[PDB]
Amino acid sequence: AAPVTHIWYFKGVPSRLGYLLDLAPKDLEKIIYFAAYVITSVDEEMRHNELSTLEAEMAVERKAVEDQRDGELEARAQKLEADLAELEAEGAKADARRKVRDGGEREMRQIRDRAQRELDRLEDIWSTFTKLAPKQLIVDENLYRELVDRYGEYFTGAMGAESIQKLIENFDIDAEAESLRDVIRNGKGQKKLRAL
Amino acid sequence: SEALRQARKDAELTASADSVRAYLKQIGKVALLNAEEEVELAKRIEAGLYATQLM
Amino acid sequence: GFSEIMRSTLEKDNTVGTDEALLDIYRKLRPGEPPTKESAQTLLENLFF
Amino acid sequence: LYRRVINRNNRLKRLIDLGAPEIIVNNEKRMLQESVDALFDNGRRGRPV
Amino acid sequence: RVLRGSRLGAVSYETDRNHDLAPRQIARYRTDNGEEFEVPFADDAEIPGTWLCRNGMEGTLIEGDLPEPKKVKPPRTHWDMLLERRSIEELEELLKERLELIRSRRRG
DNA sequence: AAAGTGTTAAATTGTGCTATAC
DNA sequence: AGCACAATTTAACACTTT
Numbered sequence: 001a002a003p004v005t006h007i008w009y010f011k012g013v014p015s016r017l018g019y020l021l022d023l024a025p026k027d028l029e030k031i032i033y034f035a036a037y038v039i040t041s042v043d044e045e046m047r048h049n050e051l052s053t054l055e056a057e058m059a060v061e062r063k064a065v066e067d068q069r070d071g072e073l074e075a076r077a078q079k080l081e082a083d084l085a086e087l088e089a090e091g092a093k094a095d096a097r098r099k100v101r102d103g104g105e106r107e108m109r110q111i112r113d114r115a116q117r118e119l120d121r122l123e124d125i126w127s128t129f130t131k132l133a134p135k136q137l138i139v140d141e142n143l144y145r146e147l148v149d150r151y152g153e154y155f156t157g158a159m160g161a162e163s164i165q166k167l168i169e170n171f172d173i174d175a176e177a178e179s180l181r182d183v184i185r186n187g188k189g190q191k192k193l194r195a196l
Numbered sequence: 197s198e199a200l201r202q203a204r205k206d207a208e209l210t211a212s213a214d215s216v217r218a219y220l221k222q223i224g225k226v227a228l229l230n231a232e233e234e235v236e237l238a239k240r241i242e243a244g245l246y247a248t249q250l251m
Numbered sequence: 252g253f254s255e256i257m258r259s260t261l262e263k264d265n266t267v268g269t270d271e272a273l274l275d276i277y278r279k280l281r282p283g284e285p286p287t288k289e290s291a292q293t294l295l296e297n298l299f300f
Numbered sequence: 301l302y303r304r305v306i307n308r309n310n311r312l313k314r315l316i317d318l319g320a321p322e323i324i325v326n327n328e329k330r331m332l333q334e335s336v337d338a339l340f341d342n343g344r345r346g347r348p349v
Numbered sequence: 350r351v352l353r354g355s356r357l358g359a360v361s362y363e364t365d366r367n368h369d370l371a372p373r374q375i376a377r378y379r380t381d382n383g384e385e386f387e388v389p390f391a392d393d394a395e396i397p398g399t400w401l402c403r404n405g406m407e408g409t410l411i412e413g414d415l416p417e418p419k420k421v422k423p424p425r426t427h428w429d430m431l432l433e434r435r436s437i438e439e440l441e442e443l444l445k446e447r448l449e450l451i452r453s454r455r456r457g
Numbered sequence: 458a459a460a461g462t463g464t465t466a467a468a469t470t471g472t473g474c475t476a477t478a479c
Numbered sequence: 480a481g482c483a484c485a486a487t488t489t490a491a492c493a494c495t496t497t
Contacts, residue, residue, distance in 0.1 A: 001313045002329045007337045011344050013472060014486070025487090026211075029345075033333065034326045035211065035218070139209055160329060189464070199274050203286045210283030213346060215334060219327055243447040245431050246440040 003161040005032055021167055027137055034159050037144045039136040040166045042155040047132065054151065058126055065122060069115035076111055080104030135167065301339040301349070308332045376400075380408035 009016045010032065015025045023031070030036040083100050125146050128138075132155055138144045144157060158166065183195045212218050229237075266272050273291040277284060284290070312328045338349045373389045378400045380386070386402045398416040402408045423429075431440075 001309055001316065002332060004333050004336045007340045007344060011337075011341075029213075030211065033215075034330045159326065161333065191464090199271065200286055203274050203278050206278075207283045207285050212283070215330060215346070218330075222323060222327075239443065239447065242431060242435065242440065243444045245428055246444045249428055 003165055005161045005164060017164070021135060021164075021171075023135060030137065030139065032160050032164060035139070037138045037141070037157045037159055038163050038167070039132060039134055039138070039155055039157045040163055041134055041170065042132045047154050051130075055126070058122075062119065062122060065115060065119055069112060072111045072115075073108060076104065076108040080108070134170070301335070301342075304335045304349075305332075305339055308335050377411050378402055378408040379411055380404050380406050382406075384408070 005017065010018075010025075010028060015028065017023075018025045018028050021028075027036070031038050080101070083104060084097070087100060088097060125143060128143060129147060129151055138147070138157070147155075148157075156166075157163075180195050184192050208221075212221060266275055270291060273295075274286045277286055277290055277294060280294070308328065308331050312325070312332055315325055315328055334346070337345055342348050372392055374392055374396075376388045376390055376396050378386050378388065380402050382404075384402070384404055386400070386404070386408060388400060390396055396410070398410050398414055399407050400410075
């Protein structure tokens with residue numbers, strides 16, 4: 001009821017499925033035993049031409065994160081103004097006022113750094129989307145759901161032997177044959193020794 | 197705690213080739229429920245079933 | 252103190268402290284598990300003690 | 301080994317028609333893969349049956 | 350000791366033949382994915398309509414008899430397990446309730 | 458001057474074999 | 480257990496940004 005890879009053609013030495021797809025065996029075992037999604041196709045035309053509108057919409061969410069950040073930062077500024085106003089409206093000790101001004105800076109730092117962490121997350125998902133290509137891997141298992149619910153129409157990804165069957169379907173043998181003929185003819189080094 | 201709050205991040209990206217341990221680490225990521233959340237989930241289930249029947 | 256190899260490894264080791272070595276031992280032994288404070292001071296005493 | 305293959309195949313065929321979350325179906329497909337691998341060449345990937 | 354064993358069966362000693370054998374007729378069934386299977390039968394035999402073919406799935410005869418759907422049901426299709434324990438008035442006064450929660454939560 | 462970045466060697470894992478008859 | 484062998488990594492390198 002679901003496809004299954006033959007074990008002789010995956011766990012050999014050298015692995016024939018790894019050579020036929022240019023995938024490492026440590027990545028092949030992550031794919032076919034349900035540990036990492038693999039991109040199996042990507043529409044290059046839609047991702048090429050709608051890239052500007054997609055990054056323009058991405059800047060909207062980035063500025064929404066920055067706007068909630070500066071709103072909480074203004075809240076922390078008004079809160080620390082209220083602390084240093086109402087505590088210092090009367091006579092007070094010095095070191096507790098130092099601790100109050102320190103804790104205000106601590107909560108402001110917490111706000112801007114939580115915002116920095118989620119800003120880096122939103123940068124990372126877009127940097128992952130902009131370099132999409134088949135025979136990749138997504139080991140995160142949360143980033144793939146973020147790529148499926150958002151920009152989920154530009155590609156396809158799967159797990160296991162049905163994804164390996166889909167990669168074998170879209171596999172033009174003559175292109176890889178001519179490229180492997182040309183690498184050993186022109187280039188040299190470890191790249192030539194591998195391509196044989 | 198950068199290291200302490202790292203190696204916690206770098207833990208969930210390893211293979212763990214024993215499949216039983218892989219299944220246990222997979223099911224560990226969902227939290228439990230209290231005594232009154234299951235009531236809300238069951239109400240949502242029964243409402244959705246009635247709506248699909250009326251559909 | 253005599254130990255011409257021991258101070259050499261103490262230079263080239265780079266890991267300083269109790270917790271900083273405990274996370275390294277746990278991450279090399281499990282491997283890849285969240286470091287806690289039970290698994291720091293009870294793993295070494297639950298393997299040889 | 302034939303019994304384990306057709307057992308996990310029948311259980312996958314029942315879990316798919318019943319409607320199931322993705323975790324149970326993926327666990328069943330991984331068990332099916334390990335059963336067929338144990339049938340063809342035992343003790344190669346992982347521990348032997 | 351020796352421990353003889355047998356897969357349960359028999360070996361008969363009729364010398365084989367190949368000329369006089371009671372006569373047979375061939376039926377042909379057709380499965381769901383357009384496959385054709387030829388089955389021999391004795392002449393004094395009621396040829397059945399459906400046959401479990403070599404493909405693994407059932408195939409009807411090539412004629413147009415249409416014997417039986419036999420009125421087989423679902424079984425329990427959840428719902429039924431919902432409708433048998435909870436009645437329609439309790440659901441209609443609940444679903445609409447949930448429906449109003451879609452109206453109030455959307456605008457706050 | 459740092460910081461990567463890809464290309465090039467020693468370490469690092471896995472596979473296969475190990476006589477004959479009672 | 481080891482003996483050999485070939486495939487797959489740390490690290491050691493100059494080259495090019497920052």
